Write a structure and sequence with these properties.
Four copies of one chain form a homotetramer.
Chain A: H1 4-10, H2 37-45, H3 59-72, E1 76-80, H4 83-94, E2 100-103, H5 109-117, E3 125-128, H6 134-140, E4 145-151, H7 163-172, E5 176-180, H8 185-188, E6 198-202, E7 216-220, H9 222-237, H10 243-253, H11 256-275, E8 280-284, H12 294-300, E9 307-312, H13 316-325, E10 330-331, E11 341-343, H14 355-358, E12 367-371, H15 377-391
Parallel strand pairs in A: 2-3, 2-4, 4-5, 5-6, 10-11
Antiparallel strand pairs in A: 1-7, 6-7, 8-9, 9-12, 11-12
Helix pairs in contact in A: 1-3, 3-10, 4-9, 13-15
Chain lengths: ~400, ~400, ~400, ~400
């Protein structure tokens, strides 16, 4: 079985099948024609091998999908126009009115919004549970529970879930487990190997790695993916990935291993640096020994990731001053880009919220999140250094 | 107000604001950075211009939207990853359980599937009505009726609706009118100017014109489009259009007047040809005086369009054989490309159904649909001629 | 029957591609790949010799570029095509392969500025003898031919006065003496004029202009005999220029070619209306447009060009102060130097391009102080008329 | 001065200057317009301006150029359509009939072809010298010697030149030193900091790193680069770089350091393995102690590189048999891609030539060249090991 890097570069493509082309040709075409109409008849049912549109079986998209399936250890993959494309397409197909879905304590903000103000407003029961608490999860299960969905690590405190534990319970009650694995990528964590049924990504982040495309991936069993493809994507979302964007994603995946290696190595030095500084109240980085769940993190993740969360003494005040003083880090909401990014949700995303109710969302007053990029650590250290001084 | 072609080329763009570039730069970027956090704070209550993330808005996508809204004559536009992206995003935000949606008698297959096997299984009521029959439409109106959605012309037989008459009946009961204007484009038909609240396109078709991208457009009021943007696209479908694909769509829109002129002139000659051939049982082209709704077609569409539906005397077998004989037309289920296309639903998209099942949904055994392309009319006539001899 | 040639539009959209041979893909896949591989090493031995038809490296050939080339060949009526990084890529690659020190090249009286520069300050400085001739004067061309005359190169219509050459007449003189004729066909495209069908050996294009049609790519084409195009591919392009066309940009070029016939029809119809309007205006001293009888080479234009083109040149009364104020009054026309874009462009040589020079130096080289040049775009003619009408008013 | 990786990601770009866009917009435009004729006046021999036409100046090309300048430590950069475009544009600008150019003993095939079958047939004189031999170089200088051109390391046997020594000699005769730095990249070797005047790159190789674009770079002093831009590029080649390709090139450059580190580590291992094998007569790799110019290589290269050449004992047959046995390595003539590549000149690039002409040229019958990619090293070893066995 060839290694991860090899697969990320080569899996599902032999140059001999496309006129010797070393890089697969991009199928920037909206539709495909048939040799006969009897060949056309077959395509819509399924029993002849081939393809019928860009919204289903484009070969550029098929290669992306297969390759992501191999990296995550799944049978099947699906490419979509965004991470929200992947999440919505998945949940829209697996759920109907009367079904219940269990969720991690905290979710990505647009995932939250979709559940509460979207699919939850169409008669689907929403329930929140701490997914490191196996006992509380078992007490939450009802006979209507069709889907369990969470992130691990989850934003913003890097809260881990016991994926193998959750999956064991879910397998008892006939529930489907869906893990958003955006933060780790398959290089660092493979939740399908710990017993999850489906994984979903915002490929916009680390997989692409260059902040230039928006894209989502679903990986899991052939049977779950076929359904999500033919119902969620085809009928209910229309979140079709451009073959141009899919080829840029495959391009980015070719350096995934190296990029994540650098993200992690930079993030550790920065996290260890933050630990020794007097402006920092507390840190959430999985590779510090003081991280509450350092044990579980190491069982699931092979390295501690590129994301650092920390809190500043001075709260909201010290955050604004820290963020505005950064000259190399950019002030922005994304993650997993080559460029280093900083976010202080109290004064950026959630300055439309009040301090009195802010703590209901698990958001500390002075919490600043850092996506550590690929820049020289010395320059990133110096930029962080002077911004901590400007926050006092 | 400058002419259509001037606006299709120029609207919403001055080179002088982008270093004099004649063609606008392509904003191929997932995220946008802020100068400070209090500047960033503004943008998450809609207080400042510029932007934050490409899943919500992007300057290339804004220009496409502005331009498309100018051409339909509407206030605001939204760009999405596909036509189904446009339709689902729209309806997901406008309907909730208990609401009724009133549908035209026939619909594009995937739209039918969204309604019957998607949103209609989440407790939204569906009723089908002949939109040409304004008495029966009035009769169908309940106060639960929140949306009237149709295509004009509609698949499969080019059936039409008096748009202004439907808008009148909507105004009376307080329902929102959504018209799928894919076939006509804003060049031949402007439903917003006849009372519709919203229009949706598969920009994949004529607007692109070249078969290379998948894309969707919503046009209407700022109020409705802002909702569809912030709920349907942002939370519920995730169908984000790639900036690369938006820039191609804009390139296609610059020749839309020229292409539609040639599309229409070619189909007219081809329609008049088919009406005289012994193998043809009947024919539906809006440009023929024998079209059932000829008067309504000259009233609403400025030209008769590029699509032809006709039925062969020999039923399903003659259809197959006609389809297989085509050498210049391709066998495919799209339309509005430079290449002429053909499909025969009874042997392609609807084959495993029986004759009874297809007559129920309006599809004759010998119904053939031609998308007349931009090729030399003599070559297309010659290809059609021989395929008809082959059909017997 | 089936030995009839498909019409121009049919071939612009279909020629040399079948979706069935690439998985049903309606649009051909883009081979954005720098390199190709070999199944055995013996398959690779033949592909650097000439025995086995295949693919080696994209600076020589690539299937996206090949399709583009076979298609342009068909439209021009040539055996073969080559695609390059720019118009000047096509020209330099062609002239660098055909000429050596001691050979003479006969040139039209006017040329595109970068071509002029290439010949006088480039290849002419490497031992290649240059000679200018009026190519509309067949007696003067006959007279300037020598035994060293290897290539006759010209544009028709020529930048910027739109001086025409008798292509058939030039090719006959070239048959007799033995020279290779190279025509820059940028202005007309294969839709309006096909120099190879009139006897030229090679044609070159700046496909950046009308062939693209949308101002977004830089590209060149050469069309001619298999032997010469091959020679140009393997000597000029491969060793001497490296002006490789990106497969992305070639795909866009093929996209633009699919509407070439429709865009040119509208360019021509807009410029005809605009030319007739400008002729009847008080401020206009004279106007140059091939579709007007007052065009110095009216009958030559009608003989070689199936329509009169999208380019107009005219002169304003009032000199430079009039031209300056005309240009700054334009609100739809953009001030810029190019042609064959969807957007209408205007340049005023005096206050723009030839600004460093004085009014005396511009009397030399035939550039009037009110000489405006127009690339008529695809916008609604009433808007273009209006923009020119209000601009003339402000130039008074 | 920030570190290499920081500059590779950020140099010459502030998101704040383009509406916050994290990735810079792609200026895919052939022409630029002017606000007035007076602004237009100062771009045709223009002092205080931006740009006029993409064959001379485009913001996207300008950014790539300034970034590549920073990495090589030179004043100005120029982007072109291919490496051969960069070489030819340079040499067409600097040489005229009667000038001599002094060449390294071996050259990349097309460069040699340019020199002997292009510019050398236009009156320019050619002389080949060993550029490690400072006394032979001094003996070869003449008053006609205007350019000294070479690669370091050089195809086929990784032969090095003493760049600082060469530059000292060129200085005494006023000659311009041009170095092809394609193999090392500015990450491993910066010939301008060793006294060279100009560097050229086939960015098609390592700079891109993913095998999808053809691109050339020239970097050097302002006055030289200006002339190559306005003469070589503008007039004599027309080798204009597509902005789309420049944007991809810039994408690839953001991981150059990480990619190069891995290319080198993979190649170091494979060289160690190949030196000890029975089938291997000789090996040329800068990282081995047995490499003739080991000390000179370590003075100029911070790491030994990703390229290996070695000779098989069994001659032409062993080469042929080895190449055909490869399953993971592709048979192909490029280099610096993520995918590992192999070429055996004597049965591929130089098959037509006689054994006597190959020896004269520098090519051994069993000379195999490896471009070691980014795959998992254990897979690359397996593939090489079995191919070595099949070589019998």
């Amino acid at each position: 079985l060839p290694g991860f890097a090899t697969r990320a570069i080569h899996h599902g493509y032999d140059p001999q099948d496309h006129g010797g082309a070393l890089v697969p040709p991009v199928y920037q075409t909206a539709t495909f024609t048939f040799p006969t109409v009897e060949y056309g008849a077959a395509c819509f049912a399924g029993e002849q091998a081939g393809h019928f549109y860009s919204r289903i079986s484009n070969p550029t998209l098929n290669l992306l999908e297969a390759r992501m399936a191999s990296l995550e250890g799944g049978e099947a993959g699906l490419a979509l126009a965004s991470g929200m494309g992947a999440i919505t397409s998945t949940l829209w197909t697996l759920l109907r009115p009367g079904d219940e879905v269990l969720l991690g304590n905290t979710l990505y903000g647009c995932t939250f919004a979709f559940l509460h103000h979207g699919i939850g407003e169409f008669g689907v029961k929403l329930r929140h549970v701490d997914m490191a608490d196996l006992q509380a999860l078992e007490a939450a299960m009802t006979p209507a529970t069709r889907v369990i969905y969470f992130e691990s690590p989850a934003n913003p405190n890097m809260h881990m879930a016991d994926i193998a534990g959750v999956a064991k319970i879910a397998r008892k009650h006939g529930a489907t487990v869906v893990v958003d694995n955006t933060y780790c990528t398959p290089y660092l964590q493979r939740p399908l190997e710990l017993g999850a049924d489906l994984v979903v990504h915002s490929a916009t982040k680390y997989l692409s790695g260059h902040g230039d495309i928006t894209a989502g991936i679903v990986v899991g069993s052939q049977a779950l993916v076929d359904r999500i493809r033919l119902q969620g994507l085809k009928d209910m979302t229309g979140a079709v990935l451009s073959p141009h964007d899919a080829a840029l994603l495959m391009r980015g995946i070719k350096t995934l291993n190296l990029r994540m290696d650098r993200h992690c190595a930079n993030a550790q030095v920065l996290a260890e640096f933050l630990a020794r500084q007097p402006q920092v109240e507390l840190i959430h980085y999985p590779g510090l020994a003081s991280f509450p769940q350092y044990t579980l993190a190491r069982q699931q993740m092979s390295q501690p990731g590129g994301m650092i969360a920390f809190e500043l003494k001075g709260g909201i005040g010290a955050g604004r001053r820290f963020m505005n003083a950064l000259q190399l880090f950019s002030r922005a909401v994304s993650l997993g880009d080559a460029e280093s990014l900083a976010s202080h949700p109290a004064s950026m995303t959630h300055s439309s919220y009040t301090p009195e109710e802010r703590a209901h969302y698990g958001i500390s007053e002075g919490l600043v999140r850092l996506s550590v990029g690929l820049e020289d650590i010395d320059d990133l250290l110096a930029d962080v250094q002077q911004a901590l001084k400007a926050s006092a």
